[PDB]
Design a binder for this molecule. Structure first.
Ligand SMILES: *[C@@H]1O[C@H](CO)[C@@H](O[C@@H]2O[C@H](CO)[C@@H](O)[C@H](O)[C@H]2NC(C)=O)[C@H](O)[C@H]1NC(C)=O
Ligand SMILES: *[C@@H]1O[C@H](CO)[C@@H](O[C@@H]2O[C@H](CO)[C@@H](O)[C@H](O)[C@H]2NC(C)=O)[C@H](O)[C@H]1NC(C)=O
Ligand SMILES: *[C@](O)(c1cccc(CSCc2c(C)nc3cccc(F)c3c2N)c1)C(F)(F)F
Ligand SMILES: *[C@](O)(c1cccc(CSCc2c(C)nc3cccc(F)c3c2N)c1)C(F)(F)F
Ligand SMILES: *[C@@H]1O[C@H](CO)[C@@H](O)[C@H](O)[C@H]1NC(C)=O
Ligand SMILES: *[C@@H]1O[C@H](CO)[C@@H](O)[C@H](O)[C@H]1NC(C)=O
Lengths: 532, 532
């Protein structure tokens, strides 16, 4: 049978699913590790022990335990990201969409979801891989990984909760794809990992980590970079938050053993309930449990690894959306609301910058404020709002990614950069939020090809080009069709720094993506904060 | 006789001079102090002892001893500022142009020349007061004052060379105008002092100095402000340069008395020859001997005097020219020359910023550089050149003046601000220098009304409006004709901050003159340099 695949962990049975008036196979909920429950909670994952019989892979698996957004009950804009399956610590599974008839050896794409390292699911409707597997003829995999304290509690030195275990979950799923994807018609020497936000940062972390470099061929990073200020913490800061988490649950705190023991007896929801109480600052865009710079997964600081070329050398395709600050300002800064235009007062403007650059002293907060204020119109509410969106997005996503691409390109084998700014025709979030985080995922996964979703024809066309760029790049290291007639996405070089806009209009090539602001965030502000 | 005036210091005899096909009287070279020669060198000036007979006031007096520009022999652009009379320490005289027939009691205007406190003359062709006395029916006075070491050598504590004596020379001439201008038909209760560059800064210093406030009614400041970073030094820095000047002339240095004694035996040219060797930094736009913040002429720091309203409350009219950096960059920064377009390399751009902000540490030099560099085109030679012009002009003239006007306006009785940007039709300096320092003096003094000078008709028209604005303001505290039909120059208020452009086109009103850059120079850079 075409839905029966024999793998090294055992036999797996899929299900035929319909797609755009045709059908493909889907193997959902394949386990790739032992359930990390009980005394295994916080521990490195272990490989799934082979099984006898046939694993029923016809339905989505549980989603990892995580914070659930309840800010807008009923609003599809936020609910679409929440877990859509029961939550469970038993959640280490992966999903595979396979073209039909079964390929013999084709390009494999492995999706890594975002969610700030504190949430995320591989089973969301926006991540359904059938449209892309089907259209681009690729075997599409989406993996899963522990988030929150479950995936990132870090007591460096201890082997019981060493940190980075969520990164090891991703790695294990990639090891499983490397070892078994051939049986699904996938080419293991051509796997491209790709992900967005924390997923984009994770992709970059596997590029840096010696232990992960050999499990894939190429990478795509969307609105996420490994050096993002919210993506990692030192071992000391991780230890500090683990202890603080412990203090919030009345734990015995005088040994890592007592602390861990205590945390392991607590129900998932008890950890999730106080997880935000451990942040060191009153901040925005900062998450409690994230990767730690431990000397193992990451041998040295990310910046020195980047400077010395200590990373996998291959091709990468990456980019950002125009409005990377909107979402977090809405959720956490004063003056913003979902149902108003959110014009921001000078007073809220400054409270916002304070929330956005937590680690800044006053001279630093003054530098950011000077840098983004138009002093001829300092009380313009729209300018203040838009200014904050740029500050949050530049500082947290755009400038860290521009720093990463410029550093990577000096040693890599090819870089392609994009700036996605298509203005949705079907606004679900208010208009002031602009081209919000994740809106491009809809095109990468080809949702515009389904009529019942109401996208414009030009959006369907945009979706097909994006999907073909991603897939062609995954197959070859180049998003462009060899000798095609379409406009050529240029390679980004350390000298000319070209990138393209990604929207419904004729491709336009630009240079030095947001250099003016990024020289401020990557060069000036840091030197200033270090002097003072 | 109309050319014979009897004053409190004695009888004075003038000369009839022709002007625009008519004639007025001129009393040139009237002495207002004892010659500050010999043991009087460096000392406070003393009042001129009355004389018997008739003082021949028919020819210009000597010019004070000073550095002579020889950078461009023959070039009229530079030669026009050099002394045009014998130089002599015996130089404390004033000139008066009086309408004919003699007024009974009219508006008096007193001109104070610029020259960085190290040079300047009241006898230059650009300062000939006949066109303005004649056209606006004002009694026009130009005074003179000691410059360089002769006027500003400062050994605070000593009564032999206390500092600020050049400022006391100006004051004495104003005391003489206050006491005698009635005999020339001048109204002593309506004297407006006005000056440019160091002359503009001096005007502001008389506004601050309790000892000078009662000698005049109103003030006009052009490209000069009392708080300009080059306009004053602390008593310690003045003492330091006096000692260093002494060391350059082999003086006995162990007592102010020995030092002064030594400096007094030296010929004028010996002091002028080493005067530039005492600057503390490799700088641009810094002069050796300038006013000192001594606790007398200035009771406390200029900034605290400005904050507390410790200054004369009256009306003021002031402004800048578009290109206040050109002249000093030409003379002192690498990459600039008079006969090339002076496109500036990135390398010279940074050497220039270094020369322009002498007192800056590296984080500071980085802040200026970030602030004026367009990172999408960092190697554009024209942008780099123009960027330097803005840095020099903003830092040295525009931003200090904007700080002064905003502070003054909080307590003053009326402020009028201008931004002069007329593009000369008769370029004498290269075009890249733009609307250079002092080009507006030509219009204030009405040179465009004389045909042999070749100005365009619209320039003659501009000259007549400027002269009438200055004169009407001097007469009334308002540059505008009561109920006129011409566009109204608006009052500058702390709230709306309006100013006008001054050029050959229809008056255009703007707001917040260069706020963006001046918030950087007046607020951010200083806080940064103080932290670090
Ligand atoms: C990616 O790597 C390949 C191979 O390592 C590079 O191709 C080589 O290019 C150099 C110079 O053009 C030639 O001397 C070799 O003959 C090429 N080798 C092969 C197998 O083609 C290629 O230039 C790299 N691309 C980028 C963007 O760095
Ligand atoms: C300059 O000062 C004059 C007088 O000190 C101000 O005129 C006074 O204005 C207030 C409010 O309009 C009145 O109560 C007085 O009756 C006025 N006095 C006179 C003599 O007119 C004038 O407002 C000031 N102008 C500016 C620009 O500050
Ligand atoms: C990233 O992983 C990230 C980026 C943007 C939002 C979040 C919040 S958590 C789940 C989620 C995601 C991944 N994307 C969204 C896009 C738009 C609106 C949303 F509500 C939404 C949501 N919830 C996480 C990082 F956090 F690293 F920025
Ligand atoms: C000011 O007093 C000043 C401003 C500009 C130049 C100088 C140099 S000294 C004599 C002089 C003056 C007053 N103005 C000029 C304008 C244009 C070209 C010139 F060559 C020139 C000259 N020499 C002094 C201060 F120094 F304070 F900036
Ligand atoms: C797999 O599970 C689904 C739903 O739980 C069920 O309908 C289907 O029949 C199962 N297949 C087998 C053979 O277990
Ligand atoms: C004044 O001086 C000028 C030139 O030195 C001379 O021509 C003129 O006659 C003098 N007048 C008197 C009366 O001294």
């Amino acid at each position: 049978s075409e839905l029966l695949v024999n793998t090294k962990s055992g036999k797996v049975m899929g299900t035929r699913v319909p797609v755009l008036s045709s059908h493909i196979s889907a193997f959902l909920g394949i386990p790739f590790a032992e359930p990390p429950v009980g005394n295994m909670r916080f521990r490195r994952p272990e490989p799934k022990k082979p099984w006898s019989g046939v694993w029923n892979a016809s339905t989505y698996p549980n989603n990892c335990q995580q914070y659930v957004d309840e800010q807008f009950p009923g609003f599809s804009g936020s609910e679409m990201w929440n877990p859509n399956r029961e939550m469970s610590e038993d959640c280490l599974y992966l999903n595979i969409w396979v073209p039909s008839p079964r390929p013999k050896s084709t390009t494999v794409m492995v999706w890594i979801y975002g969610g700030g390292f504190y949430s995320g699911s591989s089973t969301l409707d926006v991540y359904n891989g059938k449209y892309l597997a089907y259209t681009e003829e690729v075997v599409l995999v989406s993996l899963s990984y522990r988030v929150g304290a479950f995936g990132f509690l870090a007591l460096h030195g201890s082997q019981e909760a060493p940190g980075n275990v969520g990164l090891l979950d991703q790695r294990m799923a990639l090891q499983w794809v490397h070892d078994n994807i051939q049986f699904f018609g996938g080419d293991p020497k051509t796997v491209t990992i790709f992900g967005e936000s924390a997923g984009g940062a994770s992709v970059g972390m596997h590029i840096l980590s010696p232990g992960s470099r050999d499990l894939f061929r190429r990478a795509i990073l969307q609105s996420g970079s490994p050096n993002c200020p919210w993506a990692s913490v030192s071992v000391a800061e991780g230890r500090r938050r683990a202890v603080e988490l412990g203090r919030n649950l009345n734990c015995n705190l005088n040994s890592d053993e007592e602390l861990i023991h205590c945390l392991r007896e607590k129900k998932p929801q008890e950890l999730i309930d106080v997880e935000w109480n451990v942040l060191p600052f009153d901040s925005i865009f900062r998450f409690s449990f994230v990767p730690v710079i431990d000397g193992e997964f990451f041998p040295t600081s990310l910046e020195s690894m980047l400077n010395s070329g200590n990373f996998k050398k291959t091709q990468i395709l990456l980019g950002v959306n125009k409005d990377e600050g909107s979402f977090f300002l809405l959720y956490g800064a004063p003056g913003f609301s979902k149902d108003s235009e959110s014009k921001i007062s000078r007073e809220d403007f400054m409270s916002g910058v304070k929330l956005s650059v937590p680690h800044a002293n006053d001279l630093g907060l003054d530098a950011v404020t000077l840098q983004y204020t138009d002093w001829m119109d300092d009380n313009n509410g729209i300018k203040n709002r838009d200014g904050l969106d740029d500050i949050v997005g530049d500082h947290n996503v755009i400038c860290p990614l521009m720093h990463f691409v410029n550093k990577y390109t000096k040693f890599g084998n090819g870089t392609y950069l994009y700036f996605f700014n298509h203005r949705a025709s079907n606004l679900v979030w208010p208009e002031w939020m602009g081209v919000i985080h994740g809106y491009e995922i809809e095109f990468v996964f080809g949702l515009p090809l389904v009529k019942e979703l109401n996208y414009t024809a030009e959006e369907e066309a945009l979706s097909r080009r994006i999907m073909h760029y991603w897939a062609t790049f995954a197959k070859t290291g180049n998003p462009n069709e060899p000798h095609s007639q379409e406009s050529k996405w240029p390679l980004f070089t350390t000298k000319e720094q070209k990138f393209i806009d990604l929207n419904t209009e004729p491709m336009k090539v630009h240079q030095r993506l947001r250099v003016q602001m990024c020289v401020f965030w990557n060069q000036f502000l840091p030197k200033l904060l270090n002097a003072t």
